Subunit: 83 residues, 2 copies
C-alpha cells in the first residue's frame, strides 16, 4: 500500500537523508512516498521519521540517526499491520 | 530505565487504557511511568501511545486499539535501544 514517509533532519544531513530514502524507495517500490524536511531547529545528532498509511496507521520515531529511526518505524508499522 | 508513556484516548476508553497500563506496569516494573490522556477529539476507534525515554528515544504510535499501539511502540523502542 501507500506509505507517506517524512524524514525530518537538520539541514546539514539532507544529503544523507535523500540517499537513504533512495535505497528504501528502490527496495520498497513505488508505494513509498518519502520526503526530506529541512528543519534548522532539529538536532544534527538525532534522526526523526514519521510515516502514515492510507489505512490510518501512523508512527513517529526519534533515534540517534536516520537509518535506525526508519527501520524502527517500519518495525512498528509491520506490528500494527498484523496484530 | 525510565520510560514515560502516554496513552491518548477518547474519554469513553479511559477505563480500558488504565487497566492496560496496569498490566504493563506490573510486567515492566517501576521504570514505566504511564498516564492516560482524555482527549474528546480522539477517535474512539483508534489507539494512540507516545513514549519517551530519558535517553532521548521517542515513539508515537497510532493503531486500531490501545494494546496494539503500545506493543508496536515498545517494538520500535526495542529496535532503537539496540541498533
Amino acid at each position: 500500500g501507500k506509505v507517506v514517509l517524512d524524514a525530518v533532519t537538520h539541514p546539514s544531513k539532507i544529503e544523507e537523508a535523500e540517499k537513504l530514502l533512495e535505497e528504501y524507495r528502490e527496495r520498497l517500490g513505488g508505494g513509498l512516498e518519502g520526503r526530506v524536511i529541512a528543519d534548522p531547529k532539529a538536532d544534527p545528532n538525532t534522526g526523526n521519521v514519521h510515516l502514515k498509511t492510507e489505512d490510518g496507521f501512523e508512527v513517529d520515531s526519534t533515534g540517534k540517526d536516520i537509518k535506525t529511526s526508519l527501520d524502527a518505524a517500519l518495525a512498528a508499522l509491520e506490528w500494527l499491520e498484523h496484530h
